[PDB]
Amino acid sequence: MQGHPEVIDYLNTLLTGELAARDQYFIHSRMYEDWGFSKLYERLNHEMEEETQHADALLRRILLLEGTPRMRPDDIHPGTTVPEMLEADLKLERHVRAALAKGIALCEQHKDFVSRDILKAQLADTEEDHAYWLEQQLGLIARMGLENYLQSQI
Amino acid sequence: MQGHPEVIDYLNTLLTGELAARDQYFIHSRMYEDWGFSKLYERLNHEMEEETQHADALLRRILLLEGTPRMRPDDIHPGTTVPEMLEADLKLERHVRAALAKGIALCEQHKDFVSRDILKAQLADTEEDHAYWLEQQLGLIARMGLENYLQSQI
Amino acid sequence: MQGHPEVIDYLNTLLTGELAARDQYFIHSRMYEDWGFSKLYERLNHEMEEETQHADALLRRILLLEGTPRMRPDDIHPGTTVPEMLEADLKLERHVRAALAKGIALCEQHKDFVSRDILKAQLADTEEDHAYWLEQQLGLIARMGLENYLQSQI
Amino acid sequence: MQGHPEVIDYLNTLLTGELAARDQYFIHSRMYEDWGFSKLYERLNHEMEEETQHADALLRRILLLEGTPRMRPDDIHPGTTVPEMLEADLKLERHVRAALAKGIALCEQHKDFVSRDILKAQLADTEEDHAYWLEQQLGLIARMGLENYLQSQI
Amino acid sequence: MQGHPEVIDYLNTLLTGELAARDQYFIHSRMYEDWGFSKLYERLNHEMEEETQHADALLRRILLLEGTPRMRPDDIHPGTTVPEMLEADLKLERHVRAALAKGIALCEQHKDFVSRDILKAQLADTEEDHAYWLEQQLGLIARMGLENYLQSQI
Amino acid sequence: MQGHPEVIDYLNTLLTGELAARDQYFIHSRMYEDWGFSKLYERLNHEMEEETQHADALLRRILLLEGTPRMRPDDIHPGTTVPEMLEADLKLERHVRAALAKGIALCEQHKDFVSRDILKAQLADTEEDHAYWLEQQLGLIARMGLENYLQSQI
Amino acid sequence: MQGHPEVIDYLNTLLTGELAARDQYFIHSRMYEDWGFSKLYERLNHEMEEETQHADALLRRILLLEGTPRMRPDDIHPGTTVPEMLEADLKLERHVRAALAKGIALCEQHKDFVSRDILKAQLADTEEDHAYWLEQQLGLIARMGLENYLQSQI
Amino acid sequence: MQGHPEVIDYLNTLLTGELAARDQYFIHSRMYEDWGFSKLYERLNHEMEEETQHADALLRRILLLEGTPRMRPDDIHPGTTVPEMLEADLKLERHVRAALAKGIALCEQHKDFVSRDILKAQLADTEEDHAYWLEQQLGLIARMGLENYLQSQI
Amino acid sequence: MQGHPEVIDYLNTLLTGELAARDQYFIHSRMYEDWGFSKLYERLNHEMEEETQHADALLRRILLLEGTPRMRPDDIHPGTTVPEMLEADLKLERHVRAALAKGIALCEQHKDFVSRDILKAQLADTEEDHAYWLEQQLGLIARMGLENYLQSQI
Amino acid sequence: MQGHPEVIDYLNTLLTGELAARDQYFIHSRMYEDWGFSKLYERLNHEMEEETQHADALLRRILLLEGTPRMRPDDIHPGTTVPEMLEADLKLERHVRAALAKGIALCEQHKDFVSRDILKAQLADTEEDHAYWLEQQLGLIARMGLENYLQSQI
Amino acid sequence: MQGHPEVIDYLNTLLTGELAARDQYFIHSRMYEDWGFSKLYERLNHEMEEETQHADALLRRILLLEGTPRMRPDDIHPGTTVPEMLEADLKLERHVRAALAKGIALCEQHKDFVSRDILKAQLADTEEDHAYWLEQQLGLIARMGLENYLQSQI
Amino acid sequence: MQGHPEVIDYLNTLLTGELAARDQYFIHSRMYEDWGFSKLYERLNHEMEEETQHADALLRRILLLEGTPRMRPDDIHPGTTVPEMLEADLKLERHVRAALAKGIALCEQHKDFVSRDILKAQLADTEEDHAYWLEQQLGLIARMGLENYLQSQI
Ligand code: NA
Ligand code: NA
Ligand code: NA
Ligand code: NA
């Protein structure tokens, strides 16, 4: 189907944003595992899987709309300590949420309601799972101290 | 059956007290879950379910006695921190225990032994489950510190 | 996440509206059961469960958005006869439908698409299940008479 | 064990009252079945079984207390039409409720708390099952007419 | 195979008659369901399925005979009340029965015995299931009144 | 419920469009089967089933909104060769997509968000299943030739 | 039973026609298998089995009617190439269809309705299975070329 | 449905003929069993069951056609020896075959093709099961002698 | 919870009475087993288990009420012959029954209805199981002689 | 463990090469699926999974060696037609094979035999699965023509 | 087979190194268990099992090569506190890694590729399991403190 | 892939060496079976299977490397007595071990690490299974005498 060139170009932006989010969760999960925090490894591995699915859905939609997917991920900036990693992931999800909301409005204005529903589902995922979960971890650290919290993630 | 108007009016008091206790456990459980304390979420969710059952039993008994149930819950005052929430729940159960004991005596004086047995069962629930469990948590905090304790509730 | 104060305040309005709808279905179901209409008991009990779920979803969303949930239900006005109860439930669902539609528009204007999707799901529930079912009952009464209809609900 | 002669004599009164209630439910169930109301047959047959159990519990308790059980049932007055039968059963349960409450007080005054707990259980049965159920039937008749109601009991 | 042009043209008439009968049972079933008569919904839904199968068999036979199927359904006239709907369905089946019998004779005269056996099977369906069932409903209404009958269809 | 007369009238337009799409997939599937292309038969039969479900959902929604469904399908124009059939189906889905998008906007303007969500689901079906699948077939023909492609559909 | 000598003589004609059709499908199936077309082997083997059943039914019917079955098959003319074989089978089924239709009329005129129903079943088999299937194959060849088609029959 | 008065009257003739055939197989089966021929008992019992089914189908068809079934069986003439019984059954089936064939023609002339198909099925039963089986027995007697044959039926 | 010091002190009395009853059933069961009376061993072992449960319930209740349990059992006086043992157990249960009844009244006067319900359950156990069973044994001895009775307990 | 800085830097090169190979197989698989070649989709999806595993193994090894993984994939150049895609994948695997062999020698020279064994396993995967499979496809195209080959990949 | 005397002598060195590593993990596991750290017990017990397997593989290989295995373990130096034990195990694995790498080079120079592959497998075990796991524990201690960490090992 | 002509030529040497080893184990196994030594038959049959697998792996690798496999086995020299056969197999495995080691070095020098890993696996098989097992047999003969040993192989 012939998609609107502005919608396609912006799905491509969301796509390279998701490819990056996938890769950031990729390296953070494996860093957590290397340090011996299996529960953090599991959760970030799950986020990596979810982003891979999001990227897949964008990519296929771009093809259906007869676009050419942009496959270069955005630049990533991983943490080097547990606090920096959590902060880097907090920045990432805030960014994806903001980009998605813009795409949601763009889709409405070009009357691409199906592309829009795809983005709204990804936004729900980003808020109610990624952001929600990350905020939980930050709050736990605040309530019990970093050491107690990291103990609980072994 | 025609219940004694004083018994009915007091079951209504207990009823609006239980509707409130249900709603307080409702908001506390969901607050604990939002902060990432799944074990506290589970336990307060269970207390919410038990209060809903207590309210149901009162409500049906009021109807059998040909009363009109009062469905407005009492005012609730939830905590905003884990310590305040535990204190608010401690105050609540002390109050329900006191109200139940009064109703138990009232039922005896109007020779409504069945209504009385219902209240005695609810009182046993309130003491041996809610109060007992809450006291356990307070004692644990006292023995290991708030941080260690909250860690154990993740 | 920091939700828009107008969205939060209005979810709170919807929340205290759902807590009320839950309690009205609560008392109506138990009244129908007391009179011996098990089929009406079952259906209103189901509506009570669904409203409890709706309230739960609002409450959690308010917390995720860093609001403070308002836990006092709105005032309820239950019927005293089967005809009044059905009329009271008809008024309730019309009201919830109207409040939801307003919230749906409000969410769009503050670009809270996830809160908006939650409300649209609740609206679909309210129309296609509660309103639809209640209209069916009223129509049946109209087609066969109140006595025949109540017989069928035993 | 040596029971108090006043408690024993009154358990005997309750006993001959239960033997009668058993026999009244006995004849009413079989009358309903003869007329083709299987649902009324089933329910009165169940009440007959429950009264037989109540009588059994009284009888054994009288023996444990070294009394001699009085085995003659009280006089019964069954109906001859469905309305009279329901009225006769309504009178019966009102009577058993009143006799039980008196025995409950008598047991307390002679410090026979175990005999008292037996009576309180029978009273709960009499109110929440027999009386409650019978009131339901009367209300149904009032709401839909005798003919519609009897149709529903086939 | 080269079918006789008169047989083909008449199968097309039967075909557009069946497409219509399908659509009339389609709207009547959904109307009955909307009003809360699940038993009528089920039965008309079944008739809709059977007509869809009849149309399918005609359509395929027309293709085997190297005809071009006419896919526009005949005009339909649904009822707006339960009595009108039953009357509309009574008129429909009388019409299909009459058209089928004519086609059965036509097939015999052009020595298309296989097309004829197809029509005889559809006629048996139309008489012994649709017509028979509809007549049963009309008779029931006549014997017990419309209100009692509609009660039984909930 | 009282639906907005403009929404109802337009659901009726979508409805008669779906009844047609159902019938076009109906005749195309059976034509493909007659020629011996079982894989095309299966897929078009599936599309026919999906359109029947779409029509059903519109029809019921029109009834809930207290409209009168229009049951005459739109005119259809089936192909006579495999290339014409694929082209006719390509034109059909383009048309349904365009009509749905218009209805989606209309529903928003009359604040019928539930009717709107129904249409958005049907649009997703039409794009991601029907249009997507049909485009795949056209592309395959282009890449391997019509003869090779039809061989693969036996 | 004493069958009409004209019916018996004509069942014998149909019988020796079926014995032949069996033998032609016999040799064609085995020729297709020898050349490596297993799918054609399977289908012609099935037709051979069906003709054997048809011959069996005729033979037994001739015996029940106290006739003497004629067991010599008609002359057969098998193809030597795939195109000739398909043409020979096309000629065969056209012939059996024509002979059956004549027998169907003959049976009616001698009031042998049971013999007639047997022939009508065989005719349905011959048209809707053998002729239909063979026409499908010819059409496929026409749409994709002989080479592509034979590839698909391996 | 309004059946043709001549068809109805003749189904009634067939009906009282089947009620008789049922009763003749009834007494013959039980006579064979009394004499110790269990295999003859089983087979005639089966024929009795089949005739009961035939009578049932006629009876229901007469009712659907708004006739009044004639329930008096025709006169029967059972045998008193095995040879007479077999002869009586041979006469019976010849008679039913003749009556059915006449009804089959009558149904065709009044365009009652469904009634006609019912009779053709019964005729097939009568020829291919009853007549065929009875002829087999007579032939066996002829080939091995009555004594050997009766031995084989124990 | 802060229990009333008089209730706590008296639960302690009941507690040291139960610890003793446990130990007396402990030694009697093992004495019966040593002499070869397995049935008496089993029954006294069961009573020992029940008393251990009673002591456990008192002990935990004392802790919930923030008392300090008194863990020294009362003095016990076991028998040395089967008759003395039965007499010692008869004296024990009479004593526990008397102490429990006093505690039941004490609990009522201090409005500790939950502690009271615990004691009433223990009293029911003591009367209907221990006392009842022991009286049965004494009666059996009286009816059949000590030798016959002891034979039956092997 | 402290890895040799030259080994770490080169694993990083292999790592960003694998992240790229993963992404190229990612887009090619989804392109093949969009065009309707499910068998090519499956195979490239499998290669994408295998590269993701290879990248994971490199990444973890880099962490164990106390390096910092480089997470930016190398530039990719996907095809736009089936022939270009196959050529792009042929170039990719030739490149990965060459880079791996160099790393294998480098690992040996720095006596990192474990890192070396990891690379040798990846090389075996790249040759015996990816390269081997791709060469097979190219050869098939050469032997049967592009059209026949693409037909076989549907 | 006649192994090279230098390879044999060095496998013997590796062998007495593994016998020691086995014994050190032996005493450390049992020390951890004695102190109540079951998770450390399990892991060191596993390492002891793995070293026993490594020693077994060396020993058998030495025999196949017609050497005489040296069975005296190297001297071990276990810790006396958790920190010293972890340090002693860190020193051990560093030593085994260094000895293995030397043997790997020695095997290559004497063209004993099978002995070399055995050592490379043991080295992979030593790095990716023992060293990796031990480093994880040290890092955890560093991130959460020794007390928190030891708590997690109970 | 384009393999190095020296590697290919040497894999061909190894290949014709394996084809021979297969054939020698082939004839020895069958000779042992003919003489009644089933245990020797089983073991040599297993070696034959393993060599066939080795030859297969070489052959396929030669094809992947775009070589032409040499399929003539090397000359074999089987024994004629059990002692000569064991000696012939001892010579064979010594030869294959020597040829493999040379190929392993050759592969390294041409940087064909995958071909090299294949050879190292075959060498491990040859040493640890074939050579090891054969040496065991020779040693057994030496320890118990040829007669005792052959007895054990029946
Ligand atoms: Na801690
Ligand atoms: Na009625
Ligand atoms: Na081709
Ligand atoms: Na004989």
Neighbours of ion ligand 1 (CB under 5 A): A 148; B 148; K 148
Cα–Cα dist D83/D141, whole Å: 10
Cα–Cα dist D41/D36, whole Å: 9
Cα–Cα dist B10/L45, whole Å: 93
Assess contact for L78 and L88: CB atoms under 8 A.
yes
Residue of G78, G87, G88, G95 lying closest to G138 (CA atoms): G87
Phi, psi (deg, nearest 5) at residue I13: -60, -45
The residues near K123 (Cβ < 8 Å, ≥ 6 apart) are J113, J114, K97, K100, K101, K104
Neighbours of ion ligand 3 (CB under 5 A): F 148; G 148; J 148
Q: How far is CA B146 from CA B135, B139, K148, in A?
A: 14, 10, 15
What's the gap between Cα A116 and its chain centre? 17
The residues near D41 (Cβ < 8 Å, ≥ 6 apart) are D29, D30, D32, D33
Distance from CA of E67 to the nearest CA of F (A): 11
- What's the token pair of residue D22? 């058993």
Cα–Cα dist H105/L19, whole Å: 85
Residues in K touching J117 (Cβ below 8 Å):
120, 124
Cα–Cα dist F76/E73, whole Å: 11
Question: DSSP state, B72?
Answer: P
Closest Cβ–Cβ partner in H1, H64, H117 for E120: H117
Cα–Cα dist D2/F65, whole Å: 76
Q: Which chains touch H (3 or more CB pairs under 8 A)?
A: E, G
What's the gap between Cα I30 and its chain centre? 17
Nearest CA in chain B to I110: B101
The residues near E113 (Cβ < 8 Å, ≥ 6 apart) are E107, G101, G104, G120, G123
C150–D137 CB contact, under 8 Å: no
Residue B148 CA, ligand 1 centroid: distance in Å: 5
Supply angle C-alpha D78, D84, D88, rounded to 5.
50
Distance from CA of B27 to the nearest CA of C (A): 8
Assess contact for F19 and E23: CB atoms under 8 A.
yes
Cα–Cα dist I47/I125, whole Å: 10
**Over chain G, what HEC string results?**
CCCCHHHHHHHHHHHHHHHHHHHHHHHHHHHHHHHCCHHHHHHHHHHHHHHHHHHHHHHHHHHHCCCCCCCCCCCCCCCCCHHHHHHHHHHHHHHHHHHHHHHHHHHHHCCCHHHHHHHHHHHHHHHHHHHHHHHHHHHHHHHHCHHHHHHCCC
Cα–Cα dist K92/K71, whole Å: 18
Cα–Cα dist J61/J54, whole Å: 11
Handedness of CA C89, C93, C98, C102 (dihedral sign): positive
AA identity, residue F24: Q
Assess contact for L29 and L45: CB atoms under 8 A.
yes
Closest Cβ–Cβ partner in L120, L124, L131 for K1: L131
Q: How far is CA L40 from CA H20, K64, L133, L148, in A?
A: 85, 21, 11, 14
| Interface check E82 vs C, CB under 8 A | yes
Cα–Cα dist B31/B37, whole Å: 9
Question: Residue F1: which H helix or E strand, with range?
Answer: none
- What's the token pair of residue E76? 């339909």
| Interface check C19 vs B, CB under 8 A | yes
- What's the token pair of residue L121? 């696996």
Length of chain L: 154
Residue of E71, E85, E75 lying closest to E30 (CA atoms): E85
Classify C69 as helix, strand or coil.
Answer: coil
Residue of C53, C44, C51, C54 lying closest to C79 (CA atoms): C44
The residues near F68 (Cβ < 8 Å, ≥ 6 apart) are F62
| Interface check I56 vs B, CB under 8 A | no
Half-sphere exposure of I65 (CA within 13 A, CB side): 24
In chain F, DSSP assigns E strands to none
Residue of D132, D39, D122, D27 lying closest to D84 (CA atoms): D27
Rg of chain A taking only CA atoms, in angstroms: 17
Cα–Cα dist I74/F103, whole Å: 87
Cα–Cα dist C51/B48, whole Å: 15
Residue that is written with structure tokens 């439908």 in the block: C97
AA identity, residue F105: A
Question: DSSP state, E68?
Answer: -
Cα–Cα dist C32/C150, whole Å: 10
**Over A52-119, what HEC string results?**
HHHHHHHHHHHHHCCCCCCCCCCCCCCCCCHHHHHHHHHHHHHHHHHHHHHHHHHHHHCCCHHHHHHH
Cα–Cα dist B19/B48, whole Å: 10
Supply angle C-alpha D31, D34, D36, rounded to 5.
110
Cα–Cα dist B120/B58, whole Å: 12
Q: How far is CA E62 from CA E17, E119, F31, in A?
A: 14, 13, 10
Question: At B42, which CATH number?
Answer: 1.20.1260.10
Cα–Cα dist B111/D101, whole Å: 7
AA identity, residue G132: Y
What total of structural domains would you count in chain F?
1
Burial class (CB in 10 A: 0-12, 13-18, 19+), B24: buried
- What's the token pair of residue C33? 């059961």
Cα–Cα dist J118/L99, whole Å: 27
Classify E76 as helix, strand or coil.
Answer: coil
Question: Residue I88: which H helix or E strand, with range?
Answer: helix I82-109
- What's the token pair of residue K131? 């060293």
AA identity, residue L82: V
| Interface check A38 vs B, CB under 8 A | no
Assess contact for J75 and J20: CB atoms under 8 A.
yes
Q: How far is CA L18 from CA L4, L11, L40, L75, L80, in A?
A: 21, 10, 20, 11, 21
| Interface check D1 vs I, CB under 8 A | yes
Question: Residue A144: which H helix or E strand, with range?
Answer: helix A132-144
Assess contact for G63 and G69: CB atoms under 8 A.
yes
AA identity, residue L75: D
Cα–Cα dist I34/I66, whole Å: 42
Cα–Cα dist C26/C78, whole Å: 10
Assess contact for L56 and L131: CB atoms under 8 A.
no
Cβ atoms within 10 Å of D142's Cβ, excluding its own:
11
| Interface check G63 vs H, CB under 8 A | no
Cα–Cα dist J71/J61, whole Å: 14
Q: How far is CA H112 from CA C84, H97, L76, L88, in A?
A: 57, 19, 91, 95
Q: What is the DSSP string of D17-79?
A: HHHHHHHHHHHHHHHHHHHT-HHHHHHHHHHHHHHHHHHHHHHHHHHHTT-----PPPP----
Cβ atoms within 10 Å of I67's Cβ, excluding its own:
20
Residues in B touching I117 (Cβ below 8 Å):
120, 124
What's the gap between Cα A103 and its chain centre? 15
Handedness of CA A51, A53, A54, A59 (dihedral sign): positive
Assess contact for F44 and F51: CB atoms under 8 A.
no
Q: Is I28 annotated as a binding residue?
A: no
Residue that is written with structure tokens 């860190």 in the block: K90
Residue that is written with structure tokens 């029978």 in the block: D122
Structural domain span for residue B90: 1-154
Cα–Cα dist L125/L47, whole Å: 10
Residue that is written with structure tokens 């293709």 in the block: E63
Helices B132-144 and B82-109: crossing angle in degrees, nearest 10, is: 150
Residue of E26, E106, E19, E86 lying closest to E57 (CA atoms): E19
Cα–Cα dist L30/B23, whole Å: 85
Residue of E70, E86, E114 lying closest to E25 (CA atoms): E86
Burial class (CB in 10 A: 0-12, 13-18, 19+), E4: middle
What's the gap between Cα J119 and its chain centre? 12
Q: Is K74 annotated as a binding residue?
A: no
Residue of C24, C11, C28 lying closest to C69 (CA atoms): C11
Residue of F111, F17, F3 lying closest to F61 (CA atoms): F3
Assess contact for D114 and I128: CB atoms under 8 A.
yes
* F145 φ/ψ sector (left φ>0, alpha ψ -120 to 50, else beta): left
What's the gap between Cα G50 and its chain centre? 8
Cβ atoms within 10 Å of K83's Cβ, excluding its own:
12
- What's the token pair of residue G51? 């003709």
C114–A124 CB contact, under 8 Å: yes
| Interface check A151 vs B, CB under 8 A | yes
Residue H144 CA, ligand 4 centroid: distance in Å: 9
Cα–Cα dist K94/D78, whole Å: 98
| Interface check I134 vs D, CB under 8 A | no
* D137 φ/ψ sector (left φ>0, alpha ψ -120 to 50, else beta): alpha
Residue of I84, I82, I76 lying closest to I23 (CA atoms): I76
AA identity, residue B71: M
* C-beta contacts of C65-68 below 8 A and 24+ residues apart: C65/C1, C65/C2, C65/C3, C65/C7, C65/C8, C65/C11, C65/C115, C66/C1, C66/C2, C66/C3, C67/C3, C67/C8, C67/C9, C67/C11, C67/C12
Helices K82-109 and K132-144: crossing angle in degrees, nearest 10, is: 150
Cβ atoms within 10 Å of B126's Cβ, excluding its own:
26
Q: How far is CA A109 from CA A7, A58, F10, in A?
A: 10, 19, 22
Cα–Cα dist J135/A39, whole Å: 43
Question: Residue L154: which H helix or E strand, with range?
Answer: none
Half-sphere exposure of K123 (CA within 13 A, CB side): 23
Burial class (CB in 10 A: 0-12, 13-18, 19+), K20: buried
Cα–Cα dist D102/B113, whole Å: 11
Cα–Cα dist C18/C5, whole Å: 20
Give the 3-state secondary structure percentages of chain C, helix then strand then coil, rounded to 5: 80, 0, 20
C114–A120 CB contact, under 8 Å: yes
Residue of H121, H122, H13, H111 lying closest to E127 (CA atoms): H111
D117–I124 CB contact, under 8 Å: yes
- What's the token pair of residue G117? 């129903």
Cα–Cα dist C127/D143, whole Å: 29
Residue that is written with structure tokens 């509660």 in the block: C130
Cβ atoms within 10 Å of K146's Cβ, excluding its own:
13
Rg of chain E taking only CA atoms, in angstroms: 17
The residues near L49 (Cβ < 8 Å, ≥ 6 apart) are none
- What's the token pair of residue C43? 């259906």
